[PDB]
Amino acid sequence: MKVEEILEKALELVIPDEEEVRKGREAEEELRRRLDELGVEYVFVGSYARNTWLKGSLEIDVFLLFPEEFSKEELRERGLEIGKAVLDSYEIRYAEHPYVHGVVKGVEVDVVPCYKLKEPKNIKSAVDRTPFHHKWLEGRIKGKENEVRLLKGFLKANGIYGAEYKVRGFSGYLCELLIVFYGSFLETVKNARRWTRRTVIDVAKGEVRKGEEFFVVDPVDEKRNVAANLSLDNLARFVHLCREFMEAPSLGFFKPKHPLEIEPERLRKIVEERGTAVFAVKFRKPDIVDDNLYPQLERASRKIFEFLERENFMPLRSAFKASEEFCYLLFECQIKEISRVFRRMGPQFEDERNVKKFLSRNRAFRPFIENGRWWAFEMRKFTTPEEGVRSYASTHWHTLGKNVGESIREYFEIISGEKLFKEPVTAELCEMMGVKDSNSSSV
RNA sequence: GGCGCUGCGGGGUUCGAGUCCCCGCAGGCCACC
Ligand SMILES: Nc1ncnc2c1ncn2[C@@H]1O[C@H](COP(=O)(O)CP(=O)(O)OP(=O)(O)O)[C@@H](O)[C@H]1O
Ligand SMILES: Nc1nc2c(ncn2[C@@H]2O[C@H](COP(=O)(O)O)[C@@H](O)[C@H]2O)c(=O)[nH]1
Ligand SMILES: [Mg+2]
């Protein structure tokens, strides 16, 4: 398994075959015909226009260039009108920038309105850079399509492809820029082994410097970090992957993993062995797009996690999951039970003013002096993490994300033990606890 | 929708809050292509 021959075996996994290429061409041809009939200005961009889309993931991006004077409302109205007119079937769903997702002759297509700017220094809609990304790249990426494909496939197989909040990984465009900068997939991997959280890759200037954060300077706009939404942890995972790959290259790095079914009894024994409190907050998923939902789930987890820390249940990690109907916030804590009694610090013996007040409070036990200060024994409201979270979620729902909190307000429950193992959260549980041998790349 | 630093303020906790928790006010970025 020489490094060179793994890469050629990997091409069979990332390069699309002829049936798929042909399906795209036919869809492309039919799209042009429909848009030409409407006499609107448009431009094919993205991975389809540069021939760098992954096998099995054919999608065509078509942009509509509208005059800059148009209001955001006019952009939306005209964009959606033309999108619906050009597509066989369609769905409209988005967080802020309007567009139309649909199908043409079996192929998936995004029709996206934007403003026809000259120069993208100061943009008016969030997508206005994309036509300029295409112009900058089209000449510099020829002959390197398969290198880009290898990089995307590599990232995708390891769950860090895509810059959307569900993933917080590497966008496709980002991949194309890395290939332009390093020349190939192998050189990107080799150099990535030495990236740090301070690395700044400036493709237009052809240099690597250091900065305050991991920054990939967009060649069409020096203020834009193309890796803005790449999390520190996924930056780390990738660097670690590149190091592992060179050490011992394998085709397995390009093979997707999937979770294995874990019998609830195996999970039970695993939790018993660990001796921790494992539990979940279950509630109804709000009907909102992934890009609104996941940051709220992230927020709600962190808020409850931080509550657990300061209440001394010593939480280990947290995770979350959205099924079709329910969201789950998962937790593991070292403490299943804490004493009802704790100690609160009082004033120095010196000032009888504050001492007299500190002692005036009626308690079940006598305060005491220790190391020159007064102290008292107080009693906790709850003594298990499940009790604490029940109280916390019932009264601090409003701080758990706009839509997530509102849902928690109407209903939630704390689930644990084997009832939790019957819920669709085993993969998140295995990942969170670091369970060995719970995934497989087997086909 | 999520995410700022500092400043002003309300409230809770506390013997004691500039410091911990909750909320408001005042000086763009990211995701959806
Ligand atoms: N988060 C982002 N950051 C920077 N550019 C983005 C972007 N999302 C979309 N774009 C731009 O819009 C183009 C198409 O976006 P997408 O269809 O979502 C991914 P793609 O570039 O087509 O590759 P892919 O289909 O293999 O995933 C990109 O090439 C890029 O120019
Ligand atoms: N007023 C108040 N201050 C606290 C409490 N717990 C911690 N602190 C803060 O902890 C700080 C410790 O600093 P110190 O005063 O001991 O030098 C104090 O300034 C104090 O304000 C509390 O319950 N009440
Ligand atoms: Mg695409």
Amino acid identity for residue A391 in this structure: S
Q: How far apart are CA A269 and CA A277, in angstroms?
A: 13
Q: Residue A357: which nucleotide is closest by CA–C1'?
A: B15
Structure tokens of A420?
Answer: 């939790």
With a 6 A CB cut-off, is A407 part of the ligand 1 pocket? no
Residue A264 CB partners (closer than 8 Å, separation 6+): A418, A421, A422
Hey, is A128 helix, strand or coil? coil
Distance A350 CA to B4 C1' (A): 43
Other Cβ atoms within 10 Å of A411 Cβ, number: 9
Residue closest by Cα to atom 8 of ligand 1:
A171
Q: How far apart are CA A337 and CA A263, in angstroms?
A: 27
How was this structure determined? It was done by: X-ray
Q: Residue A400: which nucleotide is closest by CA–C1'?
A: B2
CB A440 within 8 A of CB A257: yes
Q: Please list the alpha-helical segments (H only) found in A91-197.
A: 130-138, 145-157, 172-182, 185-192
Residue A213 CB partners (closer than 8 Å, separation 6+): A197, A198, A225
Annotated binding site of A: 47, 50, 59, 61, 110, 133, 152, 161
Q: Residue A294: which nucleotide is closest by CA–C1'?
A: B2
What is the spatial order of strands in the sheet that A199-202 belongs to?
Answer: A207-210, A199-202, A215-218, A221-225
Q: Please list the alpha-helical segments (H only) found in A45-109.
A: 46-50, 72-86
Structure tokens of A421?
Answer: 């193992």
CB A277 within 8 A of CB A384: yes
Hey, is A416 helix, strand or coil? strand
Hey, is A284 helix, strand or coil? strand
Q: Got the DSSP string for A329-382?
A: EEEEES-S---SEEEEEEEESS-HHHHHHHHHS--SS--EEETTEEEEEEE-S-
Q: How far apart are CA A71 and CA A92, in angstroms?
A: 20
A350 touches strand B (CB under 7 A): no
Q: Nearest CA to A93 among A282, A322, A293?
A: A293
Q: Please list the alpha-helical segments (H only) found in A169-252.
A: 172-182, 185-192, 232-247
Hey, is A391 helix, strand or coil? helix
Phi/psi region, residue A227 (left: phi>0; alpha: psi -120 to 50; beta: rest), is alpha
CB A66 within 8 A of CB A115: yes
CB A179 within 8 A of CB A148: yes
Residue closest by Cα to atom 14 of ligand 1:
A46
Bases of chain B within 7 A of a CB of the protein? 1-3, 14-16, 20-23, 29-33
Residue A62 parent element (H or E): strand A59-66
Hey, is A109 helix, strand or coil? strand
Hey, is A1 helix, strand or coil? coil
Q: What is the largest CA-CA distance in chain A?
A: 90
Structure tokens of A175?
Answer: 């991949």
Q: How far apart are CA A210 and CA A316, in angstroms?
A: 33
Residue A173 CB partners (closer than 8 Å, separation 6+): A133, A137, A226
Q: Nearest CA to A216 among A167, A159, A173?
A: A173
- The residue with tokens 């969170």 is A432
Residue A257 CB partners (closer than 8 Å, separation 6+): A157, A159, A439, A440, A441
Taken in order of first residue, the domains within chain A and their CATH numbers are 1-15+144-259 (1.10.1410.30), 16-143 (3.30.460.10), 260-339+384-443 (3.30.70.590), 340-383 (3.30.70.1550)
Amino acid identity for residue A388 in this structure: G
Structure tokens of A47?
Answer: 């991975």
Q: How far apart are CA A193 and CA A241, in angstroms?
A: 8
Hey, is A65 helix, strand or coil? strand
Q: How far apart are CA A52 and CA A120, in angstroms?
A: 24
C-alpha torsion A311→A317→A322→A323, nearest 10: -110
